[PDB]
Amino acid sequence: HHWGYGKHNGPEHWHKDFPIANGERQSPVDIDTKAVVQDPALKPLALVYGEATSRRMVNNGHSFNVEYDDSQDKAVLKDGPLTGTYRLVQFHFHWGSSDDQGSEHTVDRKKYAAELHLVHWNTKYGDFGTAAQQPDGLAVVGVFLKVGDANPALQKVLDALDSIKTKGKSTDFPNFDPGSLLPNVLDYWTYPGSLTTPPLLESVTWIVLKEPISVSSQQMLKFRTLNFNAEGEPELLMLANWRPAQPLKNRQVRGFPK
Ligand SMILES: NS(=O)(=O)c1ccc(C(=O)NCCc2c[nH]cn2)cc1
Ligand SMILES: [Cu+2]
Ligand SMILES: [Cu+2]
Ligand SMILES: [Zn+2]
């Protein structure tokens, strides 16, 4: 295992291990709001999260994931720019080493403190792995975290990080409503893109919410207490885990409702 966000395993080298890193539909991107297109085909997002079943929270050595039961249509994403039904499988975050950076997507070059990704897969394909390899296979909802007021829903997530300090550790994490980390308005930008970590597959319909959720500066310190390493290995603090904006190339960013 030789990718990460460090000195010798960073994003700048990922193309040597995953050549699609230099492909035509890479994520994240900068969203130039003056260039955003209005498409009357776009629908409001339908995030049907009422019966979501969270299972566990896991340190995977690059971020932490809250895992959801996706054996059935329990928490799904429909409409927006999508055709068909996409099940929620997990959420996770990216953040930076200080509050002025950390988001993967940027807005007119502005960076937020962190970014939440709610990951969904197209039930057309039977399983998450099959879906991750198709152009219409995945949908990720991105939500910016803007430094400001402390976020009590987020605090419930942060209260668990002491149990999962090192890579491979996990903890029971039941009855977490992923809807509690959404903003009040669901206006969005959308473009076709990729996973932002290896294997960087070009299977993601991106849905970036325009409105951020809040996070305190104190809360941001807590993300940075996690470890990239496994227990027993030299400590590597998870200070930053964001990929920088990649070239837009041919692509169009569309906005809803404009
Ligand atoms: N940051 S993000 O673009 O939202 C994102 C979302 C999901 C994944 C992911 O699932 N990674 C493992 C893929 C895999 C290995 N084996 C089967 N699937 C990576 C990045
Ligand atoms: Cu490498
Ligand atoms: Cu790593
Ligand atoms: Zn992500």
153 CA → ligand 2 middle, Å: 36
Q: Given the DSSP bridges, would you call strands 54-59 and 45-48 parallel, antiparallel or unpaired?
A: unpaired
Beta partners for residue 170, in sequence order: 58
Inter-residue contact 93 to 116 (CB < 8 Å):
yes
Q: Which residues in 41-133 belong to E strands, given as ranges?
A: 45-48, 54-59, 64-68, 76-79, 86-95, 106-107, 114-122
Q: Which residues belong to the annotated binding site?
A: 92, 94, 117, 196-197
Q: Within its chain, how far is the Cα of 181 from the centroid?
A: 12
- Retrieve residue 187's tokens: 């206006």
Q: Please count the other Cβ atoms lying within 10 Å of the Cβ belonging to residue 2.
A: 9
Read off the DSSP letter of residue 64: E
Q: Which residues belong to the annotated binding site for Zn(2+)?
A: 92, 94, 117
Q: Which domain holds residue 53?
A: 1-258
Q: Determined by which method?
A: X-ray
Which residues are annotated as catalytic?
A: 62
- In the chain, the number of structural domains is 1
Inter-residue contact 92 to 124 (CB < 8 Å):
no
CA atoms within 13 A of residue 181's CA, in its CB half-sphere: 24
Resolution (A): 1.9
- Retrieve residue 153's tokens: 């829903």
What is the chain's length? 258
Ligand 1 atom at minimum distance from 140 CA: 4
Q: CA–CA separation, 111 vs 140, rounded Å?
A: 19
Q: CA–CA separation, 208 vs 141, rounded Å?
A: 6
Pocket probe mutation, ligand 1, options 90, 117, 195, 203, max atoms within 8 Å of Cβ: 195
Q: Which residues line ligand 1 (CB under 6 A)?
A: 117, 119, 129, 132, 140, 195-197, 199
Inter-residue contact 70 to 89 (CB < 8 Å):
yes
196 CA → ligand 1 middle, Å: 8
Residue 5 burial by CB count (10 A; 0-12/13-18/19+): exposed, middle or buried?
A: buried
